[PDB]
Protein backbone atom coordinates (compact mmCIF):
# COMPACT_ATOMS: atom_id res chain seq x y z
CA UNK A 1 0.00 0.00 0.00
CA UNK A 2 0.94 3.69 -0.20
CA UNK A 3 2.99 5.05 2.71
CA UNK A 4 4.00 8.64 3.50
CA UNK A 5 6.36 9.13 6.44
CA UNK A 6 7.00 12.64 7.74
CA UNK A 7 9.99 13.61 9.87
CA UNK A 8 11.90 16.69 11.01
CA UNK A 9 9.22 18.11 13.29
CA UNK A 10 9.81 19.29 16.83
CA UNK A 11 10.11 22.30 19.10
CA UNK A 12 11.39 25.59 17.69
CA UNK A 13 11.57 29.17 18.94
CA UNK A 14 9.60 31.94 17.20
CA UNK A 15 11.68 33.37 14.36
CA UNK A 16 13.47 30.04 13.95
CA UNK A 17 13.55 27.51 11.11
CA UNK A 18 12.74 23.84 10.47
CA UNK A 19 12.87 21.55 7.46
CA UNK A 20 10.26 18.81 7.20
CA UNK A 21 10.87 15.71 5.10
CA UNK A 22 8.39 13.16 3.79
CA UNK A 23 9.66 9.84 2.42
CA UNK A 24 7.16 7.94 0.31
CA UNK A 25 6.71 4.36 -0.86
CA UNK A 26 4.18 2.24 -2.74
CA UNK A 27 3.87 4.43 -5.83
CA UNK A 28 5.92 6.16 -8.52
CA UNK A 29 6.62 9.42 -6.70
CA UNK A 30 7.67 11.46 -9.75
CA UNK A 31 4.26 10.91 -11.33
CA UNK A 32 2.21 12.68 -8.62
CA UNK A 33 1.54 16.18 -7.36
CA UNK A 34 2.14 16.53 -3.61
CA UNK A 35 0.89 18.83 -0.85
CA UNK A 36 1.38 19.76 2.79
CA UNK A 37 -1.73 20.19 4.94
CA UNK A 38 -1.62 21.16 8.62
CA UNK A 39 -3.93 20.81 11.62
CA UNK A 40 -3.55 23.12 14.60
CA UNK A 41 -4.38 21.66 18.03
CA UNK A 42 -8.15 21.23 18.33
CA UNK A 43 -8.72 22.82 14.92
CA UNK A 44 -9.57 21.78 11.37
CA UNK A 45 -7.52 21.10 8.26
CA UNK A 46 -5.64 23.88 6.50
CA UNK A 47 -3.80 23.57 3.18
CA UNK A 48 -0.24 24.90 3.23
CA UNK A 49 1.45 24.21 -0.12
CA UNK A 50 1.42 22.16 -3.32
CA UNK A 51 4.08 21.16 -5.86
CA UNK A 52 3.84 19.97 -9.47
CA UNK A 53 4.98 16.74 -11.11
CA UNK A 54 7.47 15.68 -12.28
CA UNK A 55 10.19 18.29 -11.62
CA UNK A 56 8.18 20.44 -9.22
CA UNK A 57 8.85 23.69 -11.08
CA UNK A 58 5.38 24.96 -10.23
CA UNK A 59 4.40 25.61 -6.62
CA UNK A 60 1.52 27.09 -4.64
CA UNK A 61 1.27 28.52 -1.11
CA UNK A 62 -1.37 29.73 1.32
CA UNK A 63 -1.16 33.44 2.14
CA UNK A 64 -0.42 32.47 5.75
CA UNK A 65 2.94 30.97 4.76
CA UNK A 66 3.79 32.73 1.48
CA UNK A 67 7.37 34.02 1.52
CA UNK A 68 8.25 31.98 4.61
CA UNK A 69 7.77 28.36 3.54
CA UNK A 70 9.23 26.58 0.51
CA UNK A 71 7.99 23.27 -0.86
CA UNK A 72 10.37 21.14 -2.93
CA UNK A 73 10.92 17.54 -4.03
CA UNK A 74 13.74 15.09 -4.70
CA UNK A 75 12.39 12.37 -6.96
CA UNK A 76 15.49 10.18 -6.73
CA UNK A 77 14.86 9.92 -2.98
CA UNK A 78 11.06 9.71 -3.10
CA UNK A 79 11.16 12.73 -0.80
CA UNK A 80 9.02 15.84 -0.33
CA UNK A 81 10.33 18.79 1.69
CA UNK A 82 8.89 21.81 3.46
CA UNK A 83 11.41 24.47 4.43
CA UNK A 84 9.82 26.58 7.16
CA UNK A 85 11.42 29.93 8.01
CA UNK A 86 10.47 32.80 10.32
CA UNK A 87 8.16 30.56 12.31
CA UNK A 88 5.41 31.97 14.51
CA UNK A 89 3.34 30.56 17.37
CA UNK A 90 0.31 30.16 15.09
CA UNK A 91 2.30 27.77 12.87
CA UNK A 92 2.04 25.16 15.63
CA UNK A 93 0.26 22.15 14.16
CA UNK A 94 0.52 18.58 12.97
CA UNK A 95 1.95 18.74 9.45
CA UNK A 96 0.74 16.13 6.96
CA UNK A 97 2.43 14.97 3.78
CA UNK A 98 -0.30 14.25 1.19
CA UNK A 99 -0.55 12.90 -2.36
CA UNK A 100 -2.65 14.52 -5.08
CA UNK A 101 -5.00 11.80 -6.30
CA UNK A 102 -4.94 12.68 -10.02
CA UNK A 103 -2.68 14.15 -12.68
CA UNK A 104 -4.83 17.31 -12.61
CA UNK A 105 -5.87 17.77 -8.96
CA UNK A 106 -4.11 18.35 -5.64
CA UNK A 107 -7.12 16.94 -3.79
CA UNK A 108 -5.43 14.48 -1.45
CA UNK A 109 -6.00 10.74 -1.39
CA UNK A 110 -3.20 9.43 0.85
CA UNK A 111 -1.99 11.12 4.03
CA UNK A 112 1.01 10.47 6.27
CA UNK A 113 0.58 10.11 10.03
CA UNK A 114 1.80 13.68 10.41
CA UNK A 115 4.64 15.37 12.27
CA UNK A 116 4.15 17.80 15.15
CA UNK A 117 5.72 21.25 14.93
CA UNK A 118 5.63 23.35 18.11
CA UNK A 119 6.61 27.02 17.94
CA UNK A 120 7.13 28.52 21.40
CA UNK A 121 9.51 30.58 23.54
CA UNK A 122 8.69 28.48 26.61
CA UNK A 123 11.40 26.48 28.39
CA UNK A 124 11.08 22.89 29.59
CA UNK A 125 9.32 22.95 32.94
CA UNK A 126 7.74 20.24 35.04
CA UNK A 127 4.25 20.66 36.52
CA UNK A 128 3.21 21.40 40.05
CA UNK A 129 0.55 18.92 41.15
CA UNK A 130 -2.22 20.15 43.44
CA UNK A 131 -4.95 18.07 45.04
CA UNK A 132 -8.60 18.60 44.21
CA UNK A 133 -9.82 17.40 47.59
CA UNK A 134 -13.18 15.66 48.00
CA UNK A 135 -15.76 17.98 49.54
CA UNK A 136 -16.48 17.53 53.25
CA UNK A 137 -20.13 17.82 52.19
CA UNK A 138 -19.91 14.66 50.05
CA UNK A 139 -23.31 12.96 50.18
CA UNK A 140 -23.66 10.16 52.73
CA UNK A 141 -23.71 6.84 50.89
CA UNK A 142 -23.51 8.88 47.69
CA UNK A 143 -20.85 9.73 45.12
CA UNK A 144 -17.89 12.06 45.68
CA UNK A 145 -15.48 13.65 43.22
CA UNK A 146 -11.77 14.35 43.64
CA UNK A 147 -8.77 14.82 41.39
CA UNK A 148 -5.43 16.48 40.69
CA UNK A 149 -4.57 19.79 39.03
CA UNK A 150 -1.41 19.43 36.95
CA UNK A 151 -0.33 23.01 36.43
CA UNK A 152 2.26 24.98 34.47
CA UNK A 153 4.28 22.49 32.43
CA UNK A 154 5.94 22.48 29.03
CA UNK A 155 6.00 20.93 26.56
CA UNK A 156 3.21 18.39 26.11
CA UNK A 157 2.46 15.74 27.10
CA UNK A 158 1.95 14.62 30.68
CA UNK A 159 0.48 11.28 31.67
CA UNK A 160 -1.84 10.74 34.61
CA UNK A 161 -3.04 7.52 36.20
CA UNK A 162 -4.74 6.73 39.49
CA UNK A 163 -3.43 4.24 42.04
CA UNK A 164 -0.78 3.05 39.58
CA UNK A 165 -3.44 2.16 37.02
CA UNK A 166 -5.60 0.10 39.37
CA UNK A 167 -8.31 2.78 39.32
CA UNK A 168 -9.79 3.49 35.88
CA UNK A 169 -13.57 3.49 36.33
CA UNK A 170 -14.99 7.00 36.67
CA UNK A 171 -11.72 8.70 35.73
CA UNK A 172 -11.81 11.73 33.45
CA UNK A 173 -8.48 13.18 32.39
CA UNK A 174 -9.09 16.39 30.47
CA UNK A 175 -7.26 17.74 27.43
CA UNK A 176 -4.49 20.13 28.42
CA UNK A 177 -5.11 23.84 28.01
CA UNK A 178 -2.50 26.29 26.76
CA UNK A 179 -2.40 29.21 29.19
CA UNK A 180 -1.50 32.79 28.26
CA UNK A 181 1.84 32.17 29.97
CA UNK A 182 2.74 29.66 27.26
CA UNK A 183 2.61 26.82 29.78
CA UNK A 184 0.05 24.01 29.87
CA UNK A 185 -2.33 22.85 32.55
CA UNK A 186 -4.78 19.98 32.88
CA UNK A 187 -7.01 18.36 35.47
CA UNK A 188 -7.73 14.71 36.09
CA UNK A 189 -10.73 13.75 38.20
CA UNK A 190 -12.49 10.63 39.41
CA UNK A 191 -15.83 9.91 41.06
CA UNK A 192 -15.77 7.45 43.94
CA UNK A 193 -18.14 6.32 46.70
CA UNK A 194 -18.45 8.92 49.46
CA UNK A 195 -18.25 5.99 51.89
CA UNK A 196 -14.70 5.22 50.76
CA UNK A 197 -13.16 8.61 51.56
CA UNK A 198 -12.07 7.68 55.08
CA UNK A 199 -10.49 4.31 54.28
CA UNK A 200 -9.45 4.13 50.62
CA UNK A 201 -6.29 5.76 49.32
CA UNK A 202 -6.41 7.79 46.12
CA UNK A 203 -3.14 8.72 44.47
CA UNK A 204 -2.67 10.47 41.16
CA UNK A 205 0.49 9.41 39.35
CA UNK A 206 1.76 12.22 37.13
CA UNK A 207 4.64 11.82 34.71
CA UNK A 208 6.22 14.56 32.61
CA UNK A 209 9.11 12.89 30.82
CA UNK A 210 10.59 15.99 29.16
CA UNK A 211 11.48 17.36 32.62
CA UNK A 212 11.95 13.98 34.30
CA UNK A 213 9.16 14.93 36.70
CA UNK A 214 7.40 12.05 38.43
CA UNK A 215 4.92 12.97 41.13
CA UNK A 216 2.54 10.78 43.12
CA UNK A 217 0.03 12.95 44.98
CA UNK A 218 -2.21 11.47 47.66
CA UNK A 219 -5.58 13.19 47.46
CA UNK A 220 -7.48 13.09 50.74
CA UNK A 221 -10.17 14.98 52.65
CA UNK A 222 -8.82 18.32 53.87
CA UNK A 223 -8.33 18.21 57.63
CA UNK A 224 -10.29 20.75 59.67
CA UNK B 1 -10.45 32.53 -1.44
CA UNK B 2 -13.44 30.21 -1.66
CA UNK B 3 -15.25 29.66 1.64
CA UNK B 4 -16.73 26.27 2.49
CA UNK B 5 -19.54 26.34 5.06
CA UNK B 6 -20.39 22.98 6.59
CA UNK B 7 -23.58 22.37 8.52
CA UNK B 8 -24.65 21.28 10.92
CA UNK B 9 -21.39 21.62 12.85
CA UNK B 10 -22.69 18.76 14.98
CA UNK B 11 -24.94 15.97 13.72
CA UNK B 12 -26.47 13.88 16.53
CA UNK B 13 -27.73 10.48 15.39
CA UNK B 14 -28.08 6.82 16.36
CA UNK B 15 -26.55 3.82 14.58
CA UNK B 16 -28.77 2.75 11.69
CA UNK B 17 -29.98 6.28 10.94
CA UNK B 18 -29.40 8.22 7.73
CA UNK B 19 -26.84 11.02 8.01
CA UNK B 20 -27.00 14.10 5.79
CA UNK B 21 -24.03 16.48 5.82
CA UNK B 22 -24.09 19.79 3.95
CA UNK B 23 -21.30 21.90 2.44
CA UNK B 24 -21.99 25.23 0.76
CA UNK B 25 -19.40 27.19 -1.21
CA UNK B 26 -19.08 30.96 -1.58
CA UNK B 27 -18.91 30.54 -5.37
CA UNK B 28 -19.61 27.98 -8.10
CA UNK B 29 -16.86 25.33 -8.03
CA UNK B 30 -18.38 23.06 -10.68
CA UNK B 31 -18.11 19.54 -9.21
CA UNK B 32 -14.62 19.76 -7.68
CA UNK B 33 -15.76 18.83 -4.18
CA UNK B 34 -14.06 16.18 -2.04
CA UNK B 35 -15.06 14.62 1.32
CA UNK B 36 -12.83 13.29 4.10
CA UNK B 37 -13.33 11.34 7.32
CA UNK B 38 -11.09 11.84 10.36
CA UNK B 39 -11.13 9.89 13.60
CA UNK B 40 -9.38 11.14 16.76
CA UNK B 41 -5.60 10.80 16.56
CA UNK B 42 -5.74 9.58 12.96
CA UNK B 43 -4.98 11.03 9.53
CA UNK B 44 -7.92 11.95 7.28
CA UNK B 45 -9.31 9.42 4.80
CA UNK B 46 -10.66 10.35 1.35
CA UNK B 47 -14.27 9.19 0.87
CA UNK B 48 -15.48 11.00 -2.25
CA UNK B 49 -13.48 12.85 -4.89
CA UNK B 50 -14.24 15.39 -7.62
CA UNK B 51 -17.43 14.59 -9.51
CA UNK B 52 -18.94 12.83 -6.51
CA UNK B 53 -16.70 9.86 -7.26
CA UNK B 54 -16.81 7.12 -4.63
CA UNK B 55 -13.27 5.95 -3.87
CA UNK B 56 -12.43 2.25 -4.19
CA UNK B 57 -12.57 0.49 -0.82
CA UNK B 58 -15.08 2.94 0.66
CA UNK B 59 -18.36 1.26 1.71
CA UNK B 60 -21.34 1.87 -0.56
CA UNK B 61 -23.34 3.55 2.22
CA UNK B 62 -21.30 6.71 1.57
CA UNK B 63 -22.27 8.90 -1.39
CA UNK B 64 -21.81 12.47 -2.54
CA UNK B 65 -24.30 14.58 -4.43
CA UNK B 66 -24.72 18.15 -5.62
CA UNK B 67 -22.72 20.57 -7.72
CA UNK B 68 -22.31 24.31 -8.12
CA UNK B 69 -22.61 25.76 -4.63
CA UNK B 70 -24.51 23.18 -2.58
CA UNK B 71 -23.01 19.78 -1.79
CA UNK B 72 -24.16 16.85 0.31
CA UNK B 73 -22.50 13.80 1.82
CA UNK B 74 -24.97 11.06 2.67
CA UNK B 75 -24.40 8.06 4.90
CA UNK B 76 -27.41 5.88 4.13
CA UNK B 77 -27.22 3.96 7.39
CA UNK B 78 -24.73 4.80 10.14
CA UNK B 79 -22.37 2.13 11.46
CA UNK B 80 -20.65 2.57 14.85
CA UNK B 81 -17.36 3.27 13.04
CA UNK B 82 -18.93 6.18 11.12
CA UNK B 83 -19.07 8.45 14.18
CA UNK B 84 -16.24 10.85 13.46
CA UNK B 85 -15.48 14.25 11.94
CA UNK B 86 -16.07 14.96 8.26
CA UNK B 87 -14.42 17.70 6.20
CA UNK B 88 -15.22 18.97 2.71
CA UNK B 89 -12.50 20.29 0.38
CA UNK B 90 -12.74 22.25 -2.86
CA UNK B 91 -10.00 21.56 -5.41
CA UNK B 92 -11.43 23.89 -8.07
CA UNK B 93 -8.91 26.67 -7.35
CA UNK B 94 -5.91 27.56 -5.21
CA UNK B 95 -5.84 28.19 -2.35
CA UNK B 96 -7.36 24.80 -1.63
CA UNK B 97 -9.91 25.35 1.11
CA UNK B 98 -11.67 23.10 3.62
CA UNK B 99 -14.91 23.36 5.54
CA UNK B 100 -14.52 23.62 9.31
CA UNK B 101 -15.92 20.14 9.84
CA UNK B 102 -19.05 18.34 10.94
CA UNK B 103 -18.89 16.01 13.93
CA UNK B 104 -21.25 13.04 13.69
CA UNK B 105 -21.88 12.08 17.32
CA UNK B 106 -23.94 9.53 19.25
CA UNK B 107 -27.43 10.64 20.23
CA UNK B 108 -28.72 9.50 23.62
CA UNK B 109 -31.26 10.45 26.28
CA UNK B 110 -30.78 13.72 28.13
CA UNK B 111 -28.38 13.39 31.06
CA UNK B 112 -27.91 16.16 33.62
CA UNK B 113 -24.39 16.74 34.93
CA UNK B 114 -23.37 16.23 38.53
CA UNK B 115 -21.51 19.35 39.63
CA UNK B 116 -18.53 19.72 41.95
CA UNK B 117 -16.51 22.77 42.98
CA UNK B 118 -12.94 22.65 44.27
CA UNK B 119 -11.12 25.44 46.10
CA UNK B 120 -7.40 26.04 45.53
CA UNK B 121 -5.16 23.87 47.69
CA UNK B 122 -3.11 25.54 50.42
CA UNK B 123 0.07 24.42 48.66
CA UNK B 124 -0.93 26.31 45.51
CA UNK B 125 -1.83 29.43 47.48
CA UNK B 126 1.62 29.26 49.05
CA UNK B 127 3.03 29.42 45.51
CA UNK B 128 1.28 32.71 44.72
CA UNK B 129 -1.66 31.69 42.55
CA UNK B 130 -5.18 30.35 43.00
CA UNK B 131 -7.04 27.96 40.72
CA UNK B 132 -10.71 27.21 41.34
CA UNK B 133 -12.06 24.16 39.53
CA UNK B 134 -15.64 23.30 38.62
CA UNK B 135 -16.42 19.81 37.31
CA UNK B 136 -19.46 18.88 35.22
CA UNK B 137 -19.67 15.09 35.24
CA UNK B 138 -21.39 12.81 32.71
CA UNK B 139 -23.89 14.97 30.83
CA UNK B 140 -25.67 15.01 27.47
CA UNK B 141 -26.17 16.86 25.19
CA UNK B 142 -22.87 18.72 24.84
CA UNK B 143 -24.20 22.26 25.22
CA UNK B 144 -23.41 23.45 28.74
CA UNK B 145 -22.82 26.87 30.26
CA UNK B 146 -20.60 27.56 33.25
CA UNK B 147 -20.75 30.96 34.91
CA UNK B 148 -18.30 31.83 37.68
CA UNK B 149 -19.46 34.18 40.42
CA UNK B 150 -17.23 35.75 43.06
CA UNK B 151 -19.24 37.37 45.83
CA UNK B 152 -22.06 37.28 43.27
CA UNK B 153 -20.13 39.23 40.63
CA UNK B 154 -20.21 37.48 37.26
CA UNK B 155 -16.69 36.67 36.05
CA UNK B 156 -15.44 37.05 32.49
CA UNK B 157 -12.11 36.51 30.75
CA UNK B 158 -10.42 34.66 33.62
CA UNK B 159 -11.56 31.06 33.09
CA UNK B 160 -10.76 28.22 30.69
CA UNK B 161 -12.81 25.11 29.84
CA UNK B 162 -11.81 21.64 28.68
CA UNK B 163 -14.04 18.74 27.61
CA UNK B 164 -13.66 14.99 27.21
CA UNK B 165 -14.70 12.99 24.16
CA UNK B 166 -17.99 11.09 24.40
CA UNK B 167 -17.57 8.26 26.89
CA UNK B 168 -17.29 4.91 25.13
CA UNK B 169 -19.83 3.34 27.50
CA UNK B 170 -22.54 5.91 28.30
CA UNK B 171 -21.98 8.43 25.47
CA UNK B 172 -21.81 11.38 27.89
CA UNK B 173 -19.43 14.32 28.13
CA UNK B 174 -17.51 15.73 31.07
CA UNK B 175 -16.18 19.24 31.41
CA UNK B 176 -13.86 21.15 33.69
CA UNK B 177 -13.82 24.91 34.09
CA UNK B 178 -10.88 26.54 35.83
CA UNK B 179 -11.05 30.06 37.24
CA UNK B 180 -7.60 31.56 37.72
CA UNK B 181 -6.95 34.47 40.08
CA UNK B 182 -3.90 35.94 41.77
CA UNK B 183 -3.47 34.96 45.41
CA UNK B 184 -4.11 38.61 46.31
CA UNK B 185 -7.35 38.82 44.32
CA UNK B 186 -8.46 35.46 45.70
CA UNK B 187 -7.94 36.57 49.29
CA UNK B 188 -10.03 39.74 49.00
CA UNK B 189 -13.25 37.78 48.42
CA UNK B 190 -15.38 35.31 50.39
CA UNK B 191 -17.89 33.36 48.28
CA UNK B 192 -16.85 31.36 45.22
CA UNK B 193 -19.56 29.84 43.06
CA UNK B 194 -19.95 27.94 39.79
CA UNK B 195 -23.38 28.13 38.12
CA UNK B 196 -24.23 25.42 35.58
CA UNK B 197 -26.93 25.75 32.93
CA UNK B 198 -27.88 22.58 31.06
CA UNK B 199 -31.03 21.31 29.31
CA UNK B 200 -31.16 18.38 31.71
CA UNK B 201 -31.40 20.73 34.70
CA UNK B 202 -34.87 22.24 35.21
CA UNK B 203 -33.07 25.30 36.55
CA UNK B 204 -29.38 26.25 36.91
CA UNK B 205 -27.41 24.41 39.59
CA UNK B 206 -24.88 26.32 41.68
CA UNK B 207 -22.09 24.85 43.79
CA UNK B 208 -20.15 27.16 46.08
CA UNK B 209 -17.77 27.48 49.01
CA UNK B 210 -16.68 30.19 51.43
CA UNK B 211 -12.95 30.88 51.66
CA UNK B 212 -11.47 29.41 54.83
CA UNK B 213 -14.18 26.82 55.51
CA UNK B 214 -13.80 23.05 55.86
Amino acid sequence: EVQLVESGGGLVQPGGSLRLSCVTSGFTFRKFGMSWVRQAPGKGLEWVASISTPRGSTTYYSDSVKGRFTISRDNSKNTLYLQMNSLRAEDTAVYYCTRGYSSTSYAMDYWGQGTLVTVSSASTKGPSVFPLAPSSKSTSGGTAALGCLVKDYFPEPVTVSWNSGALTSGVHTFPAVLQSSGLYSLSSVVTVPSSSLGTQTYICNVNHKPSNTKVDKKVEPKSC
Amino acid sequence: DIVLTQSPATLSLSPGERATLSCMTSTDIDDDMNWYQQKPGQAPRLLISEGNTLRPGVPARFSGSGSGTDFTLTISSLEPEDFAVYYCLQSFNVPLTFGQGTKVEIKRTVAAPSVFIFPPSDSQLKSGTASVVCLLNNFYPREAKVQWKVDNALQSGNSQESVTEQDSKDSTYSLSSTLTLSKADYEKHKVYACEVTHQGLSSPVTKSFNRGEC
Binding site: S50, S52, S103 | -
Partner: peptide, 8 residues
Amino acid sequence: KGNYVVTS
Protein backbone atom coordinates in the same frame (compact mmCIF):
# COMPACT_ATOMS: atom_id res chain seq x y z
CA LYS C 1 -11.36 28.81 -12.27
CA GLY C 2 -8.94 25.90 -12.51
CA ASN C 3 -6.15 28.36 -11.79
CA TYR C 4 -3.46 25.76 -11.12
CA VAL C 5 -1.18 23.17 -12.70
CA VAL C 6 -0.42 19.72 -11.28
CA THR C 7 1.28 18.03 -14.23
CA SER C 8 3.69 20.54 -15.74
